[PDB]
Structure 1
């Protein structure tokens, strides 16, 4: 179970519970389009370990995102920290 937290305007985020079929970059954009139907979203950002905003425009970039996230979750479980969803910020 992967939870993707999709930032929305005005202090919200919509959490999407993704079940395990390959998650595609297109599928994420599709869900964002449902959640934000008045927006044009063709990409999204996430925050890396440096706090830098990283733009995702393809499946290969999305895979590097997911690997980072899973590594982070794994370390949190081991060290007994609260596990957070993968936060993304939709993007024109």
Structure 2
């Protein structure tokens, strides 16, 4: 069994307890992430190495290197009988609009599949 801990800003943490398994897929994380973070879209998440350096996972592949490191980290811990830390991941904050530095659009009256049109409305 593996526990992933999701750090969520100004809230707390979510602990995801995996199956097992196999196999953990990058999507399985993204899907859990978006499920605990419903008001956002998250394409990516980081995690820390021994140095405390964030390393980003954008896909499978890099998923495999996270699992490799964390499994090493797990081995060493209760060999020394230490308390086993969950794998902690930091979802990469993605911009909402956000992107739109400015402006709006009217939707009350459309009509209207025009060409030079469109002849209709209402309100």
Shorter-chain TM-score bucket reads: over 0.9
Shift of 1:49: 1.1
Runs of 4+ in 1 over 4 A off after TM superposition: none
RMSD: 0.9
Shift of 1:11: 4.5
- 1:19 alignment partner, SS class: coil
- Cα distance in 2 for residues equivalent to 1:36 and 1:71: 29
Shift of 1:3: 0.3
CA displacement 1:20-71 (0-9 Å, x = unmatched) = 1311101100110000011121000000111111010111101100111111
* Larger RCO, structure (CA 8 Å, separation 6 or more): 1
When residues 81 and 11 of structure 1 are mapped into structure 2, their CA distance, relative to the original with a 3 A threshold, is farther
- Cα distance in 2 for residues equivalent to 1:57 and 1:85: 20
How many residue pairs get aligned? The number is: 91
User: Greater helix share, 1 or 2?
Assistant: 1
The TM-score with structure 2 as length reference comes to 0.71
What corresponds to 1:44 in structure 2? 45
User: Greater strand share, 1 or 2?
Assistant: 1
The TM-score with structure 1 as length reference comes to 0.94
